Amino acid sequence: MSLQPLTAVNCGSLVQPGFSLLDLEGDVYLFGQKGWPKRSCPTGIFGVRIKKGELKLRAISFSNNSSYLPPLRCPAIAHFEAQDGKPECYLIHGGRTPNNELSSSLYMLSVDSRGCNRKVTLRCEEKELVGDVPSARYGHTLSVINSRGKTACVLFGGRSYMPPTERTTQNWNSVVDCPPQVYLIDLEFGCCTAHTLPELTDGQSFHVALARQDCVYFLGGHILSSDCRPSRLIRLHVELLLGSPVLTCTILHEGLTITSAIASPIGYHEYIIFGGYQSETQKRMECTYVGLDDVGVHMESREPPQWTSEISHSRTWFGGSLGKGTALVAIPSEGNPTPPEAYHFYQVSFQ
Template sequence: RAISFSNNSCYLPPLRCPAVAHFEPHDGSPECYLIHGGRTPNNELSSSLYMLSIDSRGCNRKVTFRCLEKELVGDVPSARYGHTLSVIHSRGKTACVLFGGRSYMPPSERTTENWNSVVDCPPQVFLIDLEFGCSSAHTLPELTDGQSFHVALAREDCVYFLGGHILSSDCRPPRLIRLRVELLLGSPVITCTVLQEGLSITSAITTPVGYHEYIVFGGYQSETQKRMECTYIGLDDVGVHMEPREPPQWTSEISHSRTWFGGSLGKGNAMIAVPSEGNPTPPDAYHFYQVSFQKEQDGEAPTQGCSQESTDFEDSAPLEDSEELYFGREPHELEFSSDGEGDTYNEEDEEDESQTGYW
């Protein structure tokens, strides 16, 4: 169904591979999603930071969003895609950590042959103060290579970067990077530790199954090979703990597809999509699946499942590299209803075009 935005919203362009962070309600601040960068449909790169929140909820599951662009000052991150954005808390303060990504080759280095070539962004860490919009860049000696399409998990004042692809050497090093950020008065202090105990993975899906506990699955372990395994990751005061988990019973469509993508639905649930195949192959048609993971309870084995939800999305726009944003709702509230149950007409749901607009 169409999404409506409040009349004080800015335009949110379609973006591929932006950095997305979930900002939970904190010290009176409402729940929102932070969206930075990404690739536009005409292959331009964005350097904007958007804040997407719920403006109001209506009947029949209709939701009105508000999107605001946050202006940054200082060391503003360049336009990029394939990077990560994380929210950290330190000494009663909150900040965002931006790292990685790719951008176009600098104009001074472009030639006719490599005009549209992309390179890894310099391995700088950006700290963004959301309250004042101040951004600062930090160069750390431990970070010698740029990287992209990695996983970022945050707990309190620490961010863990897992996997990723280094374009200059065309490798996926199985390393784990830990950043600790202390938001002191004056200048922040950042310490970096590089561990060789990570995963060789890119473009993975992460879904929470508990308090700072996650299941990481999907993505790719090489240019031509999907990663079919699942990994449990827990963050605590000691550090990070990783354990392999039994994957769901993947369907044949998932097992044989060359590509897949998706996102978290919260509380151990995720949605994945694979391109539909046929003769002829239908354009922009996908098989959608909901994957569910449950945390291990009192010695019981954790459970997981993969069920096909719907394939009837012929009228939808191309979805590859799209982002799934979950706003504090139960997963069953997001299910697609094909029989129209609960979708009866309600006059109060009619949009006042002076208040909202469709994008």
């Protein structure tokens, strides 16, 4: 456990509070640029490199067959691991564009070719969903399961704008939790089914979901109806058996009370959770370790690194997982005159 400050070298104004780090093939790719894509980088996606403290961002370039992506702020990222057919995929869905509307379109991102000289080409394919599509939402979670042997995706949670009946230009910008029904989406084709279960009373948002061996564990979300941060741990068990993806669920005793956590994989299935917030006012400071197996989730409090007074007295903080026991955290910075660099950056490393 260690932390080092990073110097936000030029072009650090493209990092916004909500954003994603897609970790694929060595270097990781920042995504969710602030504002619309400026023609300095007409794609919108960036490759990030951390070297001797310098955080340098390079402009990736799409391939010829790709449809282009609007910089969603807080979408649902699902890492589809390397296997047949085209490894490895990242499922982005659905978030909200730089104009405040919700996308409701599933995108699949893959790698194409390299280099020559330290260059990587990507490709984004928008994939149609026939249904019974899930309603446009943001903050939810999507997870990838492999069940004998078909790959499916489980989609759950997330806020949404009010339905188009009570929607009023005085209550326009208000959000309410989407109804709690789990959507099972096939990677191919776009046939999506929707199931409901009694144990899931209300939906959640910003809840870290972990998925392994046809089982999905949901940690504590933030329910906006009762304003509670439930410490219940949720588990659901699905199996795709022709012709239904039959789904069941169970409640567990203890689940951590964190919302919007930074889940970095370190081991085979062991994760380190950095956490966003314990309560509405007081953010989480402790770092936790969550291993998981067929038995269940195993929790362990590990020693958190000594925080600088700044990151300890920060009101809000965000970030993502660079992977391999490394994570990136950001602190909004106050000063006059404008720094102008708004976000000061830290790199945290496990072992």
